[PDB]
């Protein structure tokens, strides 16, 4: 079938995302967003972004629900497409996504059922409080922790349980 996208929410999600990706490159990855913005020289079309030349066409695909998340930034359109998430999923990797709660439902409907993990602070912000109240019903799990190592392992363990596939296997346990 496919591999489920992963969406970390709450404080520490950027550190958790980066850590997962760099620790397990063949299990986690990001997808390629579309944009209508100009490219920089070192950027590569299809690797960094899908550089789109027709803003009209982008607006059309947005209105026709090709994107799980889309918006305007410095007068250019950006979007994370279902197809892009699917292209990571089929290659056997959890697509790490940094998107709003509203994207969760869309991915579910698109049949890319996300593992959504909210990392809830022990108060050491208010943005996180209301976020929890808004998408409580959509979270796969809630993780709280004192240390970041503790939080990280809980996250990995949930992904393990929910995907039905081990992220990492001790060498000796590979039998």
Swiss-Prot record:
It comes from the Eukaryota. It is found in: Cell membrane; Basolateral cell membrane; Endoplasmic reticulum membrane; Postsynaptic density. Phosphorylated by MAPK12. Ubiquitinated; by MARCHF2 which results in its degradation. The modification Phosphoserine is found at residue 123. Abundantly expressed in atrial myocardium (at protein level). Expressed in lung fibroblasts, cervical epithelial and B-cells (at protein level). Expressed in the brain (at protein level). Widely expressed, with isoforms displaying different expression profiles. Residues 3-160 form the Guanylate kinase-like domain. The alternatively spliced domain I3 corresponding to amino acids (636-669) of isoform 4 is an EPB41 binding site mediating association to membranes in polarized and non-polarized cells. Essential multidomain scaffolding protein required for normal development. Recruits channels, receptors and signaling molecules to discrete plasma membrane domains in polarized cells. Promotes epithelial cell layer barrier function via maintaining cell-cell adhesion. May also play a role in adherens junction assembly, signal transduction, cell proliferation, synaptogenesis and lymphocyte activation. Regulates the excitability of cardiac myocytes by modulating the functional expression of Kv4 channels. Functional regulator of Kv1.5 channel. Belongs to the MAGUK family. Homotetramer. Interacts (via guanylate kinase-like domain) with DLGAP1, DLGAP2, DLGAP3, DLGAP4 and MAP1A. Interacts (via guanylate kinase-like domain) with KIF13B. May interact with HTR2A. Interacts (via PDZ domains) with GRIA1. Interacts (via PDZ domains) with GRIN2A. Interacts (via PDZ domains) with KCND2 and KCND3. Interacts (via PDZ domains) with KCNA1, KCNA2, KCNA3 and KCNA4. Interacts (via PDZ domains) with ADGRA3. Interacts with KCNF1. Interacts with CAMK2. Interacts with cytoskeleton-associated protein EPB41. Interacts with cytoskeleton-associated protein EZR. (Microbial infection) Interacts with HTLV-1 protein Tax. This is Disks large homolog 1. It comes from Homo sapiens. The chain holds residues 712 to 904 of 904 of the full protein.
């Amino acid at each position: 079938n496919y591999t489920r996208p992963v969406i970390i929410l709450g404080p520490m999600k950027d550190r958790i995302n980066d850590d997962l990706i760099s620790e397990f490159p063949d299990k986690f990855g990001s997808c390629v967003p579309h944009t209508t913005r100009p490219k920089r020289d070192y950027e590569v079309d299809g690797r960094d972004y899908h550089f789109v030349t027709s803003r009209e066409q982008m607006e059309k695909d947005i209105q026709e629900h090709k994107f799980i998340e889309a918006g305007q930034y410095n007068n250019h359109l950006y979007g994370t497409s279902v197809q892009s998430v699917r292209e990571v999923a089929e290659k056997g990797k959890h697509c790490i996504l940094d998107v709003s709660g509203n994207a969760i439902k869309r991915l579910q409907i698109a049949q890319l059922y996300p593992i959504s993990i909210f990392i809830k602070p022990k108060s050491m912000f208010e943005r996180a409080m209301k976020l929890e109240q808004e998408f409580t019903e959509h979270f796969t799990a809630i993780v709280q922790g004192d240390t970041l190592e503790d939080i990280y392992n809980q996250v990995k363990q949930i992904i393990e349980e929910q995907s039905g596939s081990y992220i990492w296997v001790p060498a000796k346990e590979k039998l």
